[PDB]
Design a protein around this ligand. Structure first.
Ligand SMILES: CC(C)[C@H](NC(=O)[C@H](C)NC(=O)OCc1ccccc1)C(=O)N[C@@H](Cc1ccccc1)[C@@H](O)[C@H](O)[C@H](Cc1ccccc1)NC(=O)[C@@H](NC(=O)[C@H](C)NC(=O)OCc1ccccc1)C(C)C
Ligand SMILES: COc1ccc(Br)c(OC)c1C(=O)O
Ligand SMILES: COc1ccc(Br)c(OC)c1C(=O)O
Lengths: 99, 99
């Protein structure tokens, strides 16, 4: 698809067997999801942005389906007000910026 | 151009008489620049990111050039570590996400 930016690029995703929306975010190095339960091991990490830092649980090898495209990578789960798809997954779905 | 996302989507911009690198940021509603002077009498504005909210300065009617594409709009200035080009400007230069 081609997505214009008059509105936030919020798209349907599937993760952990659940339908969610997430922001296709070219300004995010990493993928950061709203607090949710995922099974298995994780490691404590912190990530920084405009407000300072938040603490997140880092999960590896998480599958996310993004507009029907599969991506697998590292996902951080924590107190973000928006699910963020970062560049680690955007490259896997062949996402580019064009102008 | 077509910009892949293996690395940060940094491009050169011109603003306030200064050449700078900035992030083409689809996850940003607004454009936020590192501490600098801009012409005009600013208004206060709150913006929110990972880590919470910060208070920044809003300058309206600011000229910016982004890879040869001229734009005019509102630009925020505050304690960001990276110059961020947000959707308010990305739409003006005809920038889309594609996959
Ligand atoms: C999502 C993260 C992985 C992320 N950071 C990274 O990729 C790397 C690992 N971080 C990094 O390099 O951090 C270094 C450092 C360390 C300490 C503190 C400062 C910075 C990031 O925050 N990326 C942001 C840009 C940036 C990148 C590097 C360093 C600093 C910030 C935006 O691209 C990203 O798209 C976020 C997503 C977001 C939305 C809101 C809450 C949580 C996450 N957008 C934003 O931060 C923008 N906010 C918005 O667009 C919000 C949604 N709108 C808004 O504030 O509108 C005004 C409004 C407020 C209140 C009422 C009325 C209107 C901001 C740049 C303007
Ligand atoms: C550095 O500290 C953390 C980072 C991520 C997480 Br998740 C943490 O646990 C809540 C902690 C901590 O031990 O407080
Ligand atoms: C009013 O919309 C927002 C503005 C800034 C931020 Br930060 C928001 O959180 C993601 C929201 C929102 O929850 O929709």
């Amino acid at each position: 698809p081609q997505i214009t930016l008059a509105k936030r690029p919020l798209v349907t995703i599937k993760i952990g067997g659940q339908l969610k929306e997430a922001l296709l975010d070219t300004g995010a190095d990493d993928t950061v999801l709203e607090e949710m339960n995922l099974p298995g091991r994780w490691k404590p990490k912190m990530i920084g942005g405009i407000g300072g830092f938040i603490k997140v649980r880092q999960y590896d090898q998480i599958l996310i389906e993004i507009c029907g495209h599969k991506a697998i990578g590292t996902v951080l789960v924590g107190p973000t007000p928006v699910n963020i798809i970062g560049r680690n997954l955007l490259t896997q779905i062949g996402c580019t910026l064009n102008f």
